[PDB]
Each structure stands twice: as structure tokens, then as C-alpha cells.
Copies of this chain bind each other. A is one copy, B any other.
Amino acid sequence: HHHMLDLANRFNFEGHRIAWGTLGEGPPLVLVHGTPFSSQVWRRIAPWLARRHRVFFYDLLGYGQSDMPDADVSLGRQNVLFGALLDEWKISRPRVLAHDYGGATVLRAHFLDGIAYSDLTLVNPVAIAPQGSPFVRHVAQHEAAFTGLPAYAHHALVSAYIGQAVAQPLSDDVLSIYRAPWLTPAGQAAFYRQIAQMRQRYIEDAEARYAPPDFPVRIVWGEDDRWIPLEQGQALADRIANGKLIRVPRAGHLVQEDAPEAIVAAVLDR
């Protein structure tokens, strides 16, 4: 596979270590991943965006190379960390590129917390409620029953769940990039924890304020998304992007794997 992004740095967020890294120089561009993934979703994207921007990426608290504490790692926490990183990085009016729960996080940070962006690219965002597959919804009710699974059975569930996000099946090498953080004893608990902490109110609170903002918004949408119906993406575009949707054929929820070129084009050909 293509190389993993180097998240060399550690930011202390309220006693938790947050992994982050940067590439390139120029105007700031911040990349925000979703669940159950990590900044590695940008490994074929960030290097091309870094030719003309200083690109920032970090792993959400509870994900990837960041700490996975027995603590609040929900969307109620992630926009606080997002704002804290922008201040740590001393950046103003960043370009923002965000996927899934990362999209929820930057929509909360703008509409609830007032953070100004220079422009915003969303990729299959979780943005209007209710949201959540039946698996997420069922697992959230039996957390201890799933965290206690034998390692191989957990391995199989994580592998299948990640597989639902793509229209083209991943190679095992690539699937491993996203699965591996969840396979340690801490990671297995962390996987079901962030599912169990999901709550509709985090998205509903942001959605109540949606309106076209004072910066351009574009929404890249994998048409074959098994998790969110296409018409929900169009409804979001109607609400904040003047009805504009960048539809990506033969791509599922994880457009970064099915069609990273689509995201590169959307950001660079703006």
C-alpha cells in the first residue's frame, strides 16, 4: 500500500495524548477523519494537498494513534479538541476537509462554536439526524457483550463493519491499516466504547443552526454509501451548500478508499 502518514507530534488535550502531523507549507488546511478510522484515510490525499497548503491532520481522541481512554470520546468532546488544536496551531480561517464524524465535528465547531473557516469540503458527513446503522444501534445496547468477544470474533466484526463503508473491497493490507488500532485489548474496548457513546443530540444541536455560511461549502458524496442514503446528502447540500452536491459514482461511505482522486479534485479544482 501507499505509505502511512507520519503523525510525529503529540498534543496534550486535558491529560490525553493526541497524535498529529503536518505536510507542506502555505495556507492552512486541516483534515478531520471519522469513525472507525484515523488520519490514515488521508494517506493518498494529504500529500497532494500539501503541494500548495500546510496540511494538518490529527487522530480523534479515542481513535488511531491518539489515546483511547475510558472517558468521553463522543462528538460532545471532539469539537472541543478541534478548537484546541486550531489554537495550538495558531491558525485562523483554515481550509477544512472532513469526513463522517469529522464532518459532524467541524460543523459543530462552526455552527455551535463560531469558528471561521476559509472554505469547507465535507465527505459523506454525518450531519443530519437521526444517524447510525443498525449494527451501531444494536451494539450500543450490549457493549459489554461485544467487548468480551474472543479476539478472532472481534477481528471478524471489525473487518465486516469496515467493509460496509466501501464499494470496492479493500486488500487485507489496506484493511489492516484501519483495523489494527482496534485489535489490542485497549483498542477492542475502545472500538465498542465510541459506538456506545454515540448520541443523536450531538448532531441535532448543530443541525438546528444550519444555514449557508460566510465561506464556500462543498460536499463530496459517494453515491453507494450503505450507511447514509444519497437523498440525505442532497438534503444537506440544500441546507448549507445551495443545493450543490459532488456525487461520486461507484464510491461508498469511505470515498478516501474508493475514489481518493474525487476528494483531491474537489479541493484543488474548487
Contact = CB atoms under 8 A, between A and B. Distances in A.
So how many copies of this chain end up in the complex? 4
Given A149-B135, A265-B51, A250 B2 contact: yes
Interface residues of A, number: 44
Given A145-B142, A155-B160, A264-B264, A259 B150 contact: no
B153 A262 contact: no
A44 interface: yes
Interface in A237-270: 249-251, 259-265, 268-269
Contact of A164 (B152, B161, B262): B152
A243 to B, nearest CB: 17
A150 B135 CA distance: 6
B168 A150 contact: no
A159 interface: yes
Interface of A: 1-3, 44-45, 47-48, 51-52, 133-135, 138, 141-142, 145-146, 148-150, 152-153, 155-157, 159-161, 164, 168-169, 171, 249-251, 259-265, 268-269
